[PDB]
Antibody, heavy 213, light 216 residues
Framework: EVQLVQSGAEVKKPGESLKISCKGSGYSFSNYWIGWVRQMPGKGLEWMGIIDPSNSYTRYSPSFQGQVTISADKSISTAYLQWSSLKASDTAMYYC??????????WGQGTLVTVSSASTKGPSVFPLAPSGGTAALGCLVKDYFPEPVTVSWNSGALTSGVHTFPAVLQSSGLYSLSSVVTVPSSSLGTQTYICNVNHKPSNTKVDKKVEPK | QSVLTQPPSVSGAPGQRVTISCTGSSSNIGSGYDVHWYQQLPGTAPKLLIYGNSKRPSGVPDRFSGSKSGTSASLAITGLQSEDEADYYCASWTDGLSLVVFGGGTKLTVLGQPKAAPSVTLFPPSSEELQANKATLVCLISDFYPGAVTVAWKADSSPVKAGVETTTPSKQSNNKYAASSYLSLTPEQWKSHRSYSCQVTHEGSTVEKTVAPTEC
């Protein structure tokens, strides 16, 4: 089976160098060109460049020219994508794929690259207080690094009405997410609501009670 | 400026039929190059769907077909299925400054449940956050379908694009969609304006919520 296998996810900081790999198997690697493609989270595919591994001929998109170096070592069936100085804006998924009479018939599984200036940091947890007979309340899990955080409500006992959103990576290099639960208006004051926030990387466990105004 | 142009979105119901155009320029389709199509399901690598204008790789059902006439390529999908829901990209070799060009992509939505307008909850900055010298407005968007929204923030009546972060919609357990948007402000900014608005546009209709510093 023809395969391309890429190196594992990377978490790096601005200015650091990085070289990720794309390893071919089940075919003659030297005889087919390898393209590299960027995909910003939630965005489309962007062609970055291409390399002929037989002779090291490389061409780049004008958008990526000078920002990145594509290379290959045909003796070990591997192509590479390399940055001398990562930017936060390089945070993306990167795929390799081979040109073929069926072009890009085979793709790598992708390498996620996360670039942030942040050190490990536990979140600040802020209550989102409630203001057809139900009320929406939640917790703001602010300014943490890296992924992931776990959120539960009332130690897991409260699961209905709960939605915990995906995180945003802010311009600051830190993540934020939110978690909401819909609850009956008449249960406010009487019934107690606590979000349980777990951030393993920093060993932070926060219990925040969310109460009305 | 070798470019391949695709509509941002197409939709059809299960069992129905869609077409996705891919309009080229003189350097790509214009120069005689073949067009190829890629299907990308959420969280996966793109998959070759059509190559050389109209040929199907093995494993691709005949429900998918491609054509290319003039400077326009097109992908047709018949008997739509929910697993067809995905982003579709056209691509070609090209003669310009680039060697390979991808179209901007087309999100295919398979309309298997009814349209639902978003419910919007806008939270003002908490007391605890303000005493920490920060202020974040939290706009939560729930129970909508299909899973696409545009969020616009207003300070009084003027647009604010600075300090905005918005999540791509994801499924709630009840199988509708939810999204979130944040506006980061200094406590000074929060206090200096009369009110702030989160405006969510879904299927051409806008639902707006407003919070003011002075109200409890």
């Amino acid at each position: 089976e023809v395969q391309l296998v890429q190196s594992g996810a990377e978490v790096k900081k601005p200015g650091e160098s990085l070289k990720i790999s794309c390893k071919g198997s089940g075919y003659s690697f030297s005889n087919y060109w390898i393209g590299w493609v960027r995909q910003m989270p939630g965005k489309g595919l962007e062609w970055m460049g291409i390399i002929d591994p037989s002779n090291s001929y490389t061409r780049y998109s004008p958008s990526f020219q000078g920002q990145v170096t594509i290379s290959a070592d045909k003796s070990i069936s591997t192509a590479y994508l390399q940055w001398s100085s990562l930017k936060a804006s390089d945070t993306a998924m990167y795929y390799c794929a081979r040109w073929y009479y069926k072009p890009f018939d085979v793709w790598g599984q992708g390498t996620l690259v996360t670039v942030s200036s942040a050190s490990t940091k536990g979140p600040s947890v802020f209550p989102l207080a409630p203001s057809g007979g139900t009320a929406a309340l939640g917790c703001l899990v602010k300014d943490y690094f890296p992924e992931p955080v776990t959120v539960s409500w009332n130690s897991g006992a409260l699961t209905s009405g709960v939605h915990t959103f995906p995180a945003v990576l802010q311009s600051s290099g830190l993540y934020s997410l939110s978690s909401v639960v819909t609850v009956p208006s008449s249960s406010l004051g009487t019934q107690t609501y606590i979000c349980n926030v777990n951030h393993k990387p920093s060993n932070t466990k926060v219990d925040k009670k969310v109460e009305p105004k | 400026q070798s470019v391949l142009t695709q509509p941002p979105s197409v939709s059809g119901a299960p069992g129905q039929r869609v077409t996705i155009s891919c309009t080229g320029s003189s350097s790509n389709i214009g120069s005689g190059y073949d067009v190829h199509w890629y299907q990308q399901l959420p969280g996966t690598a793109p998959k070759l769907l059509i190559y050389g204008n109209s040929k199907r790789p093995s494993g691709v059902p005949d429900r998918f077909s491609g054509s290319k006439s003039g400077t326009s390529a097109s992908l047709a999908i018949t008997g739509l299925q929910s697993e067809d829901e995905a982003d579709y990209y056209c691509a070609s070799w090209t003669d310009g400054l680039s060697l390979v060009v991808f179209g901007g992509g087309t999100k295919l939505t398979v309309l298997g449940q009814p349209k639902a307008a978003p419910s919007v909850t806008l939270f003002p900055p908490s007391s605890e956050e303000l005493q920490a010298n920060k202020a974040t407005l939290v706009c939560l968007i729930s129970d909508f379908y299909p899973g696409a929204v545009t969020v616009a923030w207003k300070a009084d009546s003027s647009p604010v694009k600075a300090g905005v972060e918005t999540t791509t919609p994801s499924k709630q357990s009840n199988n509708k969609y939810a999204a979130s948007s944040y506006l980061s402000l200094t406590p000074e900014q929060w206090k200096s304006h009369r009110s702030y608005s989160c405006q969510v546009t879904h299927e051409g209709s806008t639902v707006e919520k407003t919070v003011a510093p002075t109200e409890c």
